[PDB]
RNA sequence: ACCUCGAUGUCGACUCAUCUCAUCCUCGAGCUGAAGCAGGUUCGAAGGGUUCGGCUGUUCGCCGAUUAAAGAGAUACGUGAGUUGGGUUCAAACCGUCGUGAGACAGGUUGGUCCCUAUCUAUUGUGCCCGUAGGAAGAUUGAAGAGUGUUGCUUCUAGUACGAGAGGACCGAAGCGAGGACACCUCUUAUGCUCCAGUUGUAGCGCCAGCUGCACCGCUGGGUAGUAACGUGUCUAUUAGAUAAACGCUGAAAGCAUCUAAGUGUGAAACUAUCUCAAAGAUUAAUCUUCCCAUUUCGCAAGAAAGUAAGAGCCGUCAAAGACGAUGACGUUGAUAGGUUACAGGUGUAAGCAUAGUGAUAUGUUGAGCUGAGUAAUACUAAUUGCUCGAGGACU
RNA sequence: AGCGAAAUUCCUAGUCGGGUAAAUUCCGUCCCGCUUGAAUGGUGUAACCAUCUCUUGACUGUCUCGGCUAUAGACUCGGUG
RNA sequence: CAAGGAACUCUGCAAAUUAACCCCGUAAGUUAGCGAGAAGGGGUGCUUAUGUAAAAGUAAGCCGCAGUGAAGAACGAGGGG
């Protein structure tokens, strides 16, 4: 498909009212206003994608191989650059909008990197069951258990490559789709949306059109107190 | 949990090849000589514009 | 490329009321719910007070408590919940901006309240 | 286990940074771990800046955290700080303390930095 | 939390006072029965002089849940107490006289005549 | 009657389970002595799932109530360098029996002790070195991989067709969904060990007042940020191809015909794609452009002194990451962390004063005071007035 | 004589009944009763038992359902080793 | 640690709950010795008066959600051998 596509950054999450009165969660980003910087195709580069860049610096924040190019690409210095597959109808040199890529109430879904909290436990990496607290314990309680798959020569006597071994959970690629547009703001080019949100304030918000309901799309509305005092 | 057979000399060797220290950086004093470790003082008993100690 | 996170605030400034009088969990009020059986709203009242105010900024969620046919019931509403109306009835006394002793303590008495 | 050292407890920690934030009023200069004295000297901006409002409600929120030595009797040091450090340093924007990393410990690497005050 | 025998109160002229939850009927693993959820009880106490036994395996429904619910408009429903009444398989309640009020989140599924004789609806 | 006693750990329960179909169901299909429904048989079929309790050591077994079923088998009836020792097989003590007695009971009975500091490999994450034929940068790519390949109820269809009456559809659509996978602390709950308020006494702070230490963090009640669930939010269809069983057309043999041998479609949750995560040491080290250099001169232009000029590393402010490593931002050109200012939240009328009472006390001052972590500016403090390496294109 | 399916009885989940959605647990019934049985003492009794032991009001983070905090470890750095 | 409160376990194993004082109140069997702390409930702060010699003890007021607010102090009932 042609996927549409921006970069934004969660910068909080919070509630809002609806009208038809249902609660409805906020998680609010901000999205940067993107100067693409190019275009490649399946036919001619072999991928079809579009390069884009944002975080604008000046030109003494950038390593002079990308910011060589940047200027040989007639682009003012920006921090990152990244494409996005499937899109091709933004073309470089033109300012993104969120009122073009998608529309009020219509279905998406967001590419992030979850937030940085280290190793966690196999009970929570794997979600296992932890041993016995009464009837006595011992030092050793959580764990999955055995890792035998059968004794004797020739039965297991390993554990094979692959196994789903504690290590680093979080901060990691993730995404859900599906997830109402709640809100537009054009002026500021912010976007309001529900659910909860991978990552920290900061984390990368890439928005692209949701697999699941692709152009699905669901009417609602703000919810303005007009009860006079 | 307990070892069957001793640990051969090379792979040991091998093992601790890998082994290295930290690396540690350099600086000069200000208003004195002896080099000293980047972000420490130098046996000058002086950081650089400065002499609020003594040298003992 | 510098952010304020403070006009979150300002995007917040939408969803709120201007009518609600200062309360400090323990003035008795009595919110009006709007509430429909298919159309025709009708309204349901319900008297009582803050038990806990709990939330940050549009988030201040607080609890209002009242008993009717020996059953209490303990319901968080919103500030500026839509259909949501509170009439603030009498002012108590503040020991503290919240209370955990409200199910410990019983009806039948006058509970104090400011002159 | 059971019984031992108890290490690095919360009023342990409290205590010691205390005994610290006295000292340093008591000679001017402290020689300790730069873990220590990075979290010393937030707390010691704090004291500047109670100092700096000077009232007989900061002489009593003061005296809470102070603690006596020899020489330096609680009376005369709180009342000398008031009198003349207190609006000595009263043109700056924080920043009122500095760590100089020294020489490590003799024995067992303890990382032996300066805290002392600044403008 | 919904589990097995779950004391809870009886909201009907009925004349027992504890009954506990033999059976979720229903979805497996589900363990949770909410506002409405029809459930398979045994009755732990009953006097002969009301009109329901003990030990029995019946049908009951829970009216109240004392650490309470998030309701789709955003305001926290909640209680001080789980109770529950006895139902005869139908939208009609065993117990005539409904003890305390009810709530809105299982008139979709029926029930309409204890709610008719509920005190208040809200 | 054996590989294995200079020993070769077996019962259950737990945790994790994985693998296979002669598959229990979700699925598709034929037949039926299958009106419909209920179905049964058989064929394909592992994509997924297949309960809770009580008694009994219990894998054996009994009972009750459920969902779609509450499948089986294997892994030493998987597995104690993972847990218990319920049990099995410990002395001991006892009942009954036997043995004259030592003692035994393939009888019961009471309780009956699980050590291991990981060397290697097998594995999960994290790093360092080198390399990929100048360096480095990203944007990649996708070969190979994985997760994901669950499902039920109600209503409309529809009491419709059918059937006869009764009984009662096949498919689809809408809602509700249960489970688990992922994320979060905005709704709710706990924690919140340098947050606040109050309180008990002791030791004190020379006393009143007020302050501190200790006392299950002294206790009690909360609580900023944060942590997490008991909480929220998405998810189960789908597409393309080939499908199994199975349904096919035509058609030869067997002049007719016949799903197959030719030509030739439809059709399962099975398979490969679409969905998602990483991925060139993938030595098949793949592509692209980019920026810098190719720096007169002395043995191969051999380091000959100018050894990137792209920059990187060391080190540091650090958390953005976070056992360390490392990732990432930032190094005076900076807001990189801290502090200051003010704000938000929490917390709750600070001290003290006036007031009346002898005093506890209460009214005003006062929503005042405080605040680890939240919010915006502040070069105020600390990232030095620092160091090292880093290309000449290796070989046609 | 007496006791009893007695912890003594393979049949035992003995037949029946009680507590029992559920209960080889437990207590009541009868005595062919592998292998009951009166100084191996028998039958009961009043109290008591760190005795066995059935059920239970609270009772609980045992389980549901795992989680928050804190030190000390683990881990890093250093000395010893 | 909200919330179910024994469902986990062969079995309530551990923990949990109670805890000083006084005020009431306490059953069956029984050898009259016991049960019994049976079981079951209330509360204690400060100031004023009354208070006796200190007391206890009571009343009036005042407040806390709470008053041996730190400490150490009792869970119980029925069944069987």
Redesign the pocket.
């Given at each position: 498909?042609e996927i549409r596509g921006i970069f934004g950054v969660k910068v909080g999450?919070?509630?809002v009212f609806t009208t038809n009165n249902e609660?409805?969660?906020?998680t609010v980003i901000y999205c940067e206003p993107n100067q693409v910087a190019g275009v490649?195709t399946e036919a001619k580069?072999?991928?079809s994608?579009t390069?884009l860049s944002f975080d604008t610096?000046?030109n003494?924040?950038?390593?002079?191989?990308?910011?060589?190019?940047?200027?040989?690409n007639n682009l003012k210095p920006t921090?990152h650059?990244?494409?996005?597959?499937?899109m091709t109808g933004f073309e470089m040199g033109q300012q993104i909008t969120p009122q073009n890529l998608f529309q009020v109430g219509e279905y998406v879904?967001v590419?992030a990197?979850?937030?940085?909290?280290?190793?966690?436990?196999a009970?929570?990496?794997?979600?296992?069951?932890?041993?016995?607290?009464?009837?006595?314990?011992?030092?050793?309680?959580?764990?999955?258990?055995?890792?035998?798959?059968?004794?004797?020569?020739a039965?297991?006597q390993?554990?094979?490559?692959?196994?789903?071994?504690?290590?680093?959970?979080?901060?990691?690629?993730?995404?859900?789709?599906?997830?109402?547009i709640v809100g537009f703001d054009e002026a500021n080019m912010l976007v309001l949306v529900?659910?909860?949100?991978?990552?920290?304030?900061?984390?990368v918000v890439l928005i692209?059109t949701?697999?699941?309901?692709p152009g699905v799309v669901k009417p609602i509305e703000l919810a303005v107190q007009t009860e006079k005092a | 949990?307990?070892?069957?057979?001793?640990?051969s000399k090379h792979?040991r060797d091998k093992?601790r090849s890998?082994d290295?220290?930290?690396?540690?950086?350099?600086?000069?004093?200000?208003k004195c000589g002896k080099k000293?470790?980047?972000?420490?003082?130098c046996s000058c008993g002086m950081?650089?514009?400065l002499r609020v100690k003594k040298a003992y | 490329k510098?952010?304020?996170?403070?006009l979150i605030d300002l995007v917040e400034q939408k969803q709120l009321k201007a009518y609600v009088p200062?309360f400090?969990?323990?003035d008795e009020v009595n919110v009006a719910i709007k509430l429909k059986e298919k159309e025709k709203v009708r309204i349901q009242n319900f008297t009582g007070t803050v038990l806990?105010?709990?939330?940050?900024?549009?988030?201040?969620?607080?609890?209002v408590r009242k008993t009717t046919d020996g059953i209490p019931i303990e319901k968080?509403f919103?500030i500026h919940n839509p259909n949501i109306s509170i009439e603030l009835k009498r002012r108590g006394?503040?020991?503290?901006?919240?209370?955990?002793?409200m199910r410990?303590?019983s009806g039948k008495a006058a509970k104090?309240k400011?002159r | 286990?059971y019984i031992?050292?108890?290490?690095?407890?919360?009023?342990?920690?409290?205590?010691?940074?205390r005994q610290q934030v006295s000292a340093v009023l008591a000679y001017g200069k402290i020689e300790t771990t730069?873990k220590?004295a990075?979290?010393?000297?937030?707390?010691l901006?704090?004291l500047?800046?109670?100092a700096?409002?000077d009232?007989?409600?900061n002489r009593?929120?003061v005296?809470?955290?102070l603690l006596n030595t020899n020489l330096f009797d609680?009376?005369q040091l709180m009342d000398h700080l008031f009198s003349k450090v207190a609006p000595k340093y009263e043109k700056?924007?924080?920043?009122?303390?500095?760590?100089?990393?020294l020489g490590p410990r003799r024995?067992?690497?303890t990382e032996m930095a300066i805290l002392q005050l600044?403008? | 939390?919904?589990?097995?025998?779950?004391?809870?109160n009886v909201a009907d002229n009925t004349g027992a006072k504890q009954v506990?939850?033999?059976?979720?009927?229903?979805?497996?693993?589900?363990?949770?029965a909410?506002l409405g959820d029809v459930v398979?009880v045994?009755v732990?106490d009953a006097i002969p002089s009301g009109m329901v036994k003990?030990?029995?395996?019946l049908r009951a429904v829970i009216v109240r849940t004392?650490?309470?619910?998030?309701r789709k408009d955003?305001?926290?429903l909640?209680f001080?107490?789980?109770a529950c009444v006895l139902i005869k398989e139908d939208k009609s309640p065993r117990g005539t006289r409904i003890f305390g009020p009810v709530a809105r989140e299982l008139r979709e599924?029926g029930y309409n005549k204890i709610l008719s004789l509920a005190v208040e609806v809200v």
């Open positions: 498909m999450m919070s509630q609660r409805l969660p906020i490649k580069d072999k991928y994608a390069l610096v000046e003494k924040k950038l390593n002079k191989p990308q910011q060589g190019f940047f200027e040989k921090k650059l990244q494409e996005i597959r499937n879904d590419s990197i979850s937030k940085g909290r280290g190793f966690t436990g009970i929570k990496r794997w979600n296992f069951k932890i041993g016995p607290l009464g009837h006595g314990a011992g030092y050793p309680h959580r764990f999955q258990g055995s890792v035998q798959a059968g004794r004797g020569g039965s297991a390993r554990v094979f490559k692959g196994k789903k071994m504690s290590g680093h959970y979080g901060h990691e690629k993730v995404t859900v789709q599906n997830l109402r529900s659910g909860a949100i991978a990552g920290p304030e900061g984390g692209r949701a697999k699941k309901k | 949990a307990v070892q069957q057979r001793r640990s792979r093992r890998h290295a220290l930290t690396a540690q950086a350099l600086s000069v004093c200000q000293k470790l980047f972000h420490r003082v950081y650089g514009d | 510098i952010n304020k996170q403070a200062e400090s969990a323990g806990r105010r709990r939330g940050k900024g549009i988030s201040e969620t607080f609890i968080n919103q006394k503040v020991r503290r901006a919240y209370i955990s002793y410990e303590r104090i400011e | 286990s031992n050292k108890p290490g690095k407890t919360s009023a342990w920690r409290v205590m010691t940074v730069l220590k990075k979290n010393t000297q937030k707390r901006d704090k500047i800046t109670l700096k409002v009232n007989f409600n009593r929120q005296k809470k955290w609680v009376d700056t924007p924080g920043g009122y303390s500095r760590v100089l990393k024995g067992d690497a600044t403008d | 939390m919904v589990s097995f025998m779950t004391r809870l506990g939850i033999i059976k979720v009927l229903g979805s497996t693993r589900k363990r949770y909410f398979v045994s732990k003990k030990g029995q395996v004392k650490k309470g619910q998030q955003g305001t926290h909640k001080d107490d789980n599924r």
